[PDB]
Structure formats: C-alpha cells, structure tokens
Design a protein that fits this description.
six-stranded mixed sheet, binds 2'-deoxyuridine 5'-monophosphate, transferase (chains A, B), globular, alpha+beta, two-stranded antiparallel sheet, homodimer, Thymidylate Synthase, Chain A, 316 residues
C-alpha cells in the first residue's frame, strides 16, 4: 500500500536504530541515510494509519509559496505551527513586561499551572499579531523561513532571487535540465538561526511528461514531523506539475538523520498494528494555473478515511 | 564485495533507465533518486573491476582542502582534470591571438588535425600557468570551485566563511549535531557559472565513535565520473575521521540524476563481466593531524590490484 515505505522506516528505526542522546535531554533511536519513494500516480501519500490534518499542511505550503514570512497569515487560517518562534522573540525583547517565560518549552510540561500562564501570554500574542499592524510587522515576521529562502534569497549585492519562480521557468523551457534545484541552506545565516532548515534542498526531474521531486531532509522526527513533511512535498510536486502542464511522477524522500524520540515508542508500536486503507485523491482547480496565486479552496483532498489520531508529547 | 553497489547501479541504469536527450547531443539512459552505501571499515571503495588513478583523486582532494582555486597546483602534480575550464577563459579573452578554438570540445573529436592544434595551445597554456605568476593569477584561477565554496564562502557583508573548518570544529565539540552540513550550492552564483557543482551538499554524522558521511550528488556520469566521486568522498570521510580522532563509519552516496552516456554502453557491459577483487586498504600518516596541511605523501593506498583500464570517449 502507498504508505508502506513510511511504516517500513518506523520498523527500521525500531529494530536497527542507535540510541543517541541529542540537543535536549529527550533520547532518540537514530539512523543515518535512508531513501523512500511514493508513486504519486497511485494516490496522495497522506497517512491513512493515523489522522493527519491536511488543512494545516495546505495553509503552511501556500504561505511558503506566497514568499510570506509573517505568522499573521497562518493565524488567519488557524494554523499555529510557527507561533513559538515568533513568541520567543516577543518575550526576549524590551517591550515585554510579563511572567519571565525563560525555557518555556520544558516548563510547559513540568508545571500544569505555568502551562496556563504560558497559554495565556500566547493567546494575547496571537491576538495582537492579528489586530495590530505595527506589532505584526515587528514580531509576526520571522525573517529567515522557507518563504524568503525559496522566493527572496538575499544576494551579496543587496537584491533578491526568486529561486523557485526561476526553476519553474527552467522546467517549462529546459525540462531535461539536471540543475532544477532549490536550496534553503545559506551558510552565512545558518550559525545564527534558531532552526537551520530541516528541509535542506530539493531537485526536480522530468521525463516522459512526468515531474518528480527529491527532498534532502537533514533531520526528521519520524513520529510527529515526517507524516507532515511527506504530504507537504508531495503537494508541492502536484502544484508545480499543474503549473507546468505535466503529469506527476514520484516523490523521493531522502534522509540524513531520521530519529524516533524515546517518548514516542508506544505510540509508533500501536500505529504499526494498523492496516493501511486506500489512499486519498488530490484534486486541483482545473481553471486556475498560477500556483503563486493559489488559495485554500484551490486544493481538495478526496476519500481520506483515516484511523484515529494518536496523541504524543512534543520533545523538549 | 565492497564495490557491488556500484555494479548494481550500472545494471540498474541498463535495464531500467530512460532514454533522455541532454545538454549536448550525446544521449543518456537515466534514473532519478538512488542511494548506495559503503562500509569503510571493510576497505577502501576504489573500483577493482577497472583501474582508477588514485593519484589524481588524491591531488584533487588536497587542492580542495587547501581552499586553492588555482589550476597551477594541479599541473604541478600532473593533474589535468580542470585544465579545460581555465583554458576556456584564456581563449575567450582579449590577450588571446591564435586559432579560433570555438566549440573546441566537439571539434577535438571530429577532426584529428584540429585536435593537434588544440593539444598544442593547451600545452602552451599549461606551461605559462606553471611559469608566469601574473598569468597564473589571471587565467589559472577558476574563482568559484570546491576549494573556495568549502573554505571561503563569500558573505553578503564581504567576508569569508570556512564552512568546512567550522564543521570540523562542530564535530569535535558537538558530535551528535544534526547540522554538520557543507553546501557547495550558492543560489546567487549558480545561474552564471559554467558548471554549477555536481556535488551539491554533504552531511556528517557521528555515532559510537564512528564518522559517516552522506553526499547529495545532483548529476552523475556513471561510467567516467562516479568511480572518481566515490573514492574522493570516501577519502574525505577518512581525512576528517583522522583529524577528529574518530573511526570511520559509512560513506553514503545519494543521487539525483544518474546517467549513462550512450557511447559508454559497450564499455560498461564489458566491465559487468568482471569479478571484483579484495578492496585496497587506506593508510594515513599516524603522526600528522592537521588535514589542512596534508600532502601527497601523507595518504597511501595498499593492495590495490585492479583489472585493466577501460578506455571510453568523453561526452561532448
Ligand atoms: O517539518 C519538520 C520540522 C521539524 N522536524 C524536526 C526534526 C528534529 O527533531 C527537529 C530539528 O532539530 P535539529 O535537527 O536542528 O537538531 O525538528 C521534522 O521532522 N519535520
Ligand atoms: O566529478 C564529476 C564531475 C562531473 N560529472 C558529470 C555528470 C554530468 O554528466 C556532467 C554535468 O553536467 P550537468 O549535469 O550540469 O548538466 O558532469 C560527474 O559525474 N562527476
């Protein structure tokens, strides 16, 4: 079935992965170098063995595609995936006068009463970003995130490259090119960023009127992150193919370090006892062609019928 | 045997690859997305089923490691791999007064008498680069090649990052880091370079005192290029491990487009009828530790006993 490479990867980390501590205190089981593939003509690889919210994946991708780096657009589609990076900034600034919020990541899991003074400041941070333009401009804007890396890469001569829009143009006019590459990795920013990009680079490929895409992901959270990651680049391959008048090939997912947090063992083992269902179908607006101007309603998911969601703690 | 993944890859492109024309007129059989691995504790992956000149691979790597971008150092170790890119420049310049050399690449294979007016200008270009300092500075210097990308990446504020030397420092002090990445892909240079880097990015990984390395190669000439590529990054993994006091793990070779030129079919089919021998051993100077100051004599290859070389035409 379509998601099997994903369950094979989980099985593999389970009986083959090495114990390694990491950047936190939450241990991992870990492998290095892995490759899986999804034939997108066979259906859309949103996991059926656990419910994944597509509406989140689809509004985060549109954000990236519009070159946007401001949380505000996410909040308008009730997408909180990026709140913590914005909040971090607000909180560690002059204008902030409130409970001290230091190491709020850990301390939301070790104190149920703190976790409500945190969820309080956050709801107020989001509300302000939504209603106060100057505030949004100051704290809503992440700066270096996929929307500027893909669409507005800063040059040493002070201009701005649309990496992705140029490559789309190369696909239309030189389909056989071996240089259809978008990189998110800037050696000059990377030492001072809070999160150097996990999705480091990707490459497109055309053959027999079919578009394929390969992602090099340096670091992957197998239980929580990877199910989102897969759907996000599978959708990108679909949007680009649609823009270029091509059919869709394969999505190839290459990993550097793929890890399983040790507080996710039971959840993954439960998931492995489920039996994949038939994959959903993806449907794109036949009438609209500029993907840079796609909106929520231009992407529908059909026949998605998943097992229930599995709750897991985030790693500190 | 140690090189089997390489012969499996050739076999795969042969009966599974798609005919695709390319950037020249010389057709290819082509696949997209492939991964192979070499356990470097099992020996050094220099192909035994065809003679590969290690002395070339080893002087080209030292060049890169010294941050050098000047052909001159190559010529001193009689290494001509990079001559054509330098010559191209010389020839397409004001100071050049000689036979017109336009499309000299093609026209060295379609004219046996031209091919000797080309080999004449080239021997004179190399001799000058070797003896005339101002000339070397002007035409010997490639500018953007792996030695500056790895060791002297230009920032937008006019300084210069030693990407590789910083990452070596990260390996010594944060071995478990998921961000041990060296990129050669600069979105601002790539549209104006004659050859955007084939070796796009690589990532190191440590576990149980062992160093592994994964290469993302966007485009690979399977018959001619890949045997050099493999040995070159396998040696890098060895030099870095030696510098950091680690043992050596695996070299993981990931491909975007891996192609076989159609004028290489007979040669590859002949190679596939050979039987791999035991792999050579690599030996590094036990007393010298700064790889940035390694020289030819600091790297020895032991027990390399290959089948004869197989002659093939370069693709135009
Ligand atoms: O879309 C995402 C975003 C994040 N991660 C995870 C992987 C790691 O657990 C963490 C990054 O930490 P470092 O790898 O930088 O150390 O983020 C994913 O798998 N997918
Ligand atoms: O070390 C090398 C250097 C070059 N190539 C080849 C692969 C391609 O045939 C060619 C690059 O052309 P483009 O891929 O940029 O189109 O160089 C290799 O395989 N290994």
């Amino acid at each position: 079935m379509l998601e099997q490479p994903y369950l094979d990867l989980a099985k593999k980390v389970l009986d083959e992965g090495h114990f390694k501590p990491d950047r936190t205190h939450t241990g991992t089981y870990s492998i290095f170098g892995h490759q899986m593939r999804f034939d997108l003509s066979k259906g859309f690889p949103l996991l059926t063995t656990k419910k994944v919210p597509f509406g989140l994946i689809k509004s985060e991708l549109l954000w990236f595609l519009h070159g946007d780096t401001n949380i505000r657009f996410l909040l308008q589609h009730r997408n909180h995936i990026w709140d913590e990076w914005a909040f971090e900034k607000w909180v560690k600034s002059d204008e902030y006068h409130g409970p001290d919020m230091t190491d709020f990541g850990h301390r939301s899991q070790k104190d149920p009463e703190f976790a409500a003074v945190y969820h309080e400041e956050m709801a107020k941070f989001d509300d302000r970003v939504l209603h106060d333009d100057a505030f949004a401009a100051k704290y809503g804007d992440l700066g270096l995130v996929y929307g500027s890396q893909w669409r507005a890469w800063h040059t040493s001569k002070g201009d701005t490259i649309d990496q992705l829009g140029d490559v789309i143009e190369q696909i239309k006019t030189h389909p056989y090119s071996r240089r259809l590459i978008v990189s998110a990795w800037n050696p000059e920013d990377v030492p001072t960023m809070a999160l150097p990009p996990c999705h480091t680079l990707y490459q497109f490929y055309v053959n027999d009127g079919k578009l394929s895409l390969q992602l090099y992901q340096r670091s992957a959270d197998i239980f929580l992150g990877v199910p989102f990651n897969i759907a996000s680049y599978a959708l990108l391959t679909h949007l680009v193919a649609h823009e270029c008048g091509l059919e869709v090939g394969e999505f190839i997912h290459t990993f550097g370090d793929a890890h399983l947090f040790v507080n996710h063992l039971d959840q993954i083992k439960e998931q492995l006892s489920r039996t994949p269902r038939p994959a959903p179908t993806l449907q794109l607006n036949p009438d609209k062609h500029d993907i840079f101007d796609f909106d929520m309603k231009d992407i529908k998911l059909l026949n998605y019928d998943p097992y229930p969601a599995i709750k897991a703690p985030v790693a500190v």
